[PDB]
């Protein structure tokens, strides 16, 4: 099985460093994290269904800007992305923002505590993340977390996965569709070969990881439909500057 | 590189792996043959045992107990021990090994444990089925085992280790057993260096799961006592009674 070529190791070093340089978990999150108090976002023990717990929502939005910002820095550290028109860059960033963020939290899933550590600092439960606003998306991200545990992804693999999510040529309104596909394929090929190098113990690893890319897309779309409910149920004063633009 | 298995250890590894495989009935993956226990059974309504759920479990429990015994009898080291120690070691590790077998068949997607590789149950069905909080402990262990990707050999060696526990009350040949256990641990350690898992501190964390299993085994025993008080005698298969006496 083909391992990465010299040229691909460069790209790999480039994406890996960009990810690590913008991954706030570069200080042992597992040891640094703090658990969000059980009082916040607990089952509310209602007609019309899940109503966003403004209290919980408040804690999530107070640390969401840095997460959004870090996704932009990540893309901006990739030469290929920097070659794209300003218009495409934006379209791509808006389309993958929550996909990438979701991946980042999912990879910080902890079976023993049943939590996801947001921004490598805030540990939360299904209930908390659900009642805080993501609704069933909460369940989706946790499932992704559970399914990714056996994959043992390192920074390079998460970085490459982020880059594949970034170079999505099917986003609506893109100008350089063909060029973006070329970039994505280059990441896929490097990823594919890096995987062979690492030698994971799981059958049909490549095919299974690709399906995870699909889950993230589903997750990204649900985020958007989820944001619509937030706008109805949450007062403007709770929305950070960038958070709004992300779905605009 | 760390020490890999010696020629002699590859022999012990071949023996235990075959014993486990021959007694696990997975020559045809549990996934493509398992059946899900219907949601109305053991559905949410300490606690009181759901006789119907319990009935379903004790209906396939004898074969599981039996395979654990056949696993041990397939190990030459185990056969050199006195009948009395064999009984003690079996009663001591039975639920530990079964719990471990259910835990490696944990499925994140459907959120179930496939018992005997044929019956998929939820954390809820298993709990109301009689195990109470032990169900949580086992599901928990199944969740943490996911990243370890253990193959037949590793689960096999783990079982050999749980089996040869020289600290069980009443054992006569404590030294011999202790020695047998170490032979398995050492070959395990080496087999591990040969596999090369990508989980940090893999060895120490796996050893810690043995700890968890001993705790699960002890909790099942006190869970059994509640069962003897709440479940009609008829729902107890004979071998199920003798093992957990
Ligand atoms: O973990 C990281 O680095 C990134 C990250 C940060 C956060 I705050 C987060 O939670 C969200 C996101 C959107 C949203 O509308 C709500 I309410 C909560 C997730 I999922 C991931
Ligand atoms: O999965 C396997 O191979 C072995 C296995 C088989 C069964 I049935 C099982 O469930 C139990 C065990 C004890 C008990 O008192 C009750 I009620 C249910 C478990 I956990 C494991």
UniProtKB/Swiss-Prot annotation, chain B:
Chain residue ranges for the region called Interaction with NR2F6: 35-245
Sequence positions that bind 3,3',5-triiodo-L-thyronine 1: 220
Localization annotation: Nucleus
Consequence when changing residue 101 to H: In PRTH; impairs hormone binding
Binding annotation for 3,3',5-triiodo-L-thyronine: 67, 116
One GO cellular component term noted in the UniProt record for this chain: RNA polymerase II transcription regulator complex
Presence of the UniProt keyword Metal-binding in the record: yes
UniProt effect for mutating residue 116 to S: No effect on thyroid hormone binding
UniProt-listed GO biological process terms: cell differentiation; cellular response to thyroid hormone stimulus; DNA-templated transcription; female courtship behavior; mRNA transcription by RNA polymerase II; negative regulation of female receptivity; negative regulation of transcription by RNA polymerase II; positive regulation of thyroid hormone receptor signaling pathway
Entry keyword set: Deafness, Disease variant, DNA-binding, Metal-binding, Nucleus, Receptor, Transcription, Transcription regulation, Zinc, Zinc-finger
Residues that bind L-thyroxine: 67, 116, 220
MF (Gene Ontology): chromatin DNA binding; DNA binding; DNA-binding transcription factor activity; DNA-binding transcription factor activity, RNA polymerase II-specific; enzyme binding; nuclear receptor activity; RNA polymerase II cis-regulatory region sequence-specific DNA binding; sequence-specific double-stranded DNA binding
The keyword Membrane is annotated on this UniProt entry: no
Domain spans labelled NR LBD: 8-245
Entry superkingdom: Eukaryota
Role, per record: Nuclear hormone receptor that can act as a repressor or activator of transcription. High affinity receptor for thyroid hormones, including triiodothyronine and thyroxine.
Domain notes: Composed of three domains: a modulating N-terminal domain, a DNA-binding domain and a C-terminal ligand-binding domain.
Record's subunit section: Binds DNA as a dimer; homodimer and heterodimer with RXRA. Interacts with the coactivators NCOA1/SRC1, NCOA2/GRIP1, NCOA7 and MED1/TRAP220 in a ligand-inducible manner. Interacts with the corepressor NCOR1 in absence of ligand. Interacts with C1D. Interacts with NR2F6; the interaction impairs the binding of the THRB homodimer and THRB:RXRB heterodimer to T3 response elements. Interacts with PRMT2 and THRSP. Interacts with TACC1; this interaction is decreased in the presence of thyroid hormone T3.
Entry's family note: Belongs to the nuclear hormone receptor family. NR1 subfamily.
Protein name: Thyroid hormone receptor beta
Organism: Homo sapiens
Residues of the full protein shown: 210 to 460 of 461
């Amino acid at each position: 099985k083909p391992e990465p070529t010299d040229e691909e190791w460069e790209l790999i070093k480039t994406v890996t460093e960009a990810h690590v340089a913008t991954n706030a978990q570069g200080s042992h999150w597992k040891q640094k994290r703090k658990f969000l108090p059980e009082d916040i976002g607990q089952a509310p023990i209602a007609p019309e269904g899940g109503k966003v717990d403004l209290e919980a929502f408040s804690h999530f939005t107070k640390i969401i800007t840095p997460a959004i910002t870090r996704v932009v820095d990540f893309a901006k550290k990739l030469p290929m992305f920097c070659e794209l028109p300003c218009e495409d860059q934006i379209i791509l960033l808006k389309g993958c923002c929550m996909e990438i963020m979701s991946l980042r939290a999912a990879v910080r899933y902890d079976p023993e505590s049943e939590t996801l550590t947001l921004n490598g600092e805030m540990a939360v439960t299904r209930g908390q993340l659900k009642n805080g606003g993501l609704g069933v998306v909460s369940d989706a991200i946790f499932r992704l977390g559970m399914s990714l545990s056996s994959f043992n992804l390192d920074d390079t693999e998460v970085a490459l996965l982020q880059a594949v999510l970034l170079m999505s040529s099917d986003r609506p309104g893109l100008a350089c569709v063909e060029r973006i596909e070329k970039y994505q394929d280059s990441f896929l090929l490097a990823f594919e070969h890096y995987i062979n190098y690492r030698k994971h113990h799981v059958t049909h690893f490549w095919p299974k990881l690709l399906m995870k890319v699909t889950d993230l897309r589903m997750i990204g779309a649900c985020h958007a439909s989820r944001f619509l409910h937030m706008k109805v149920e949450c007062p403007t004063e709770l929305f950070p500057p960038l958070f709004l633009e992300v779905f605009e």
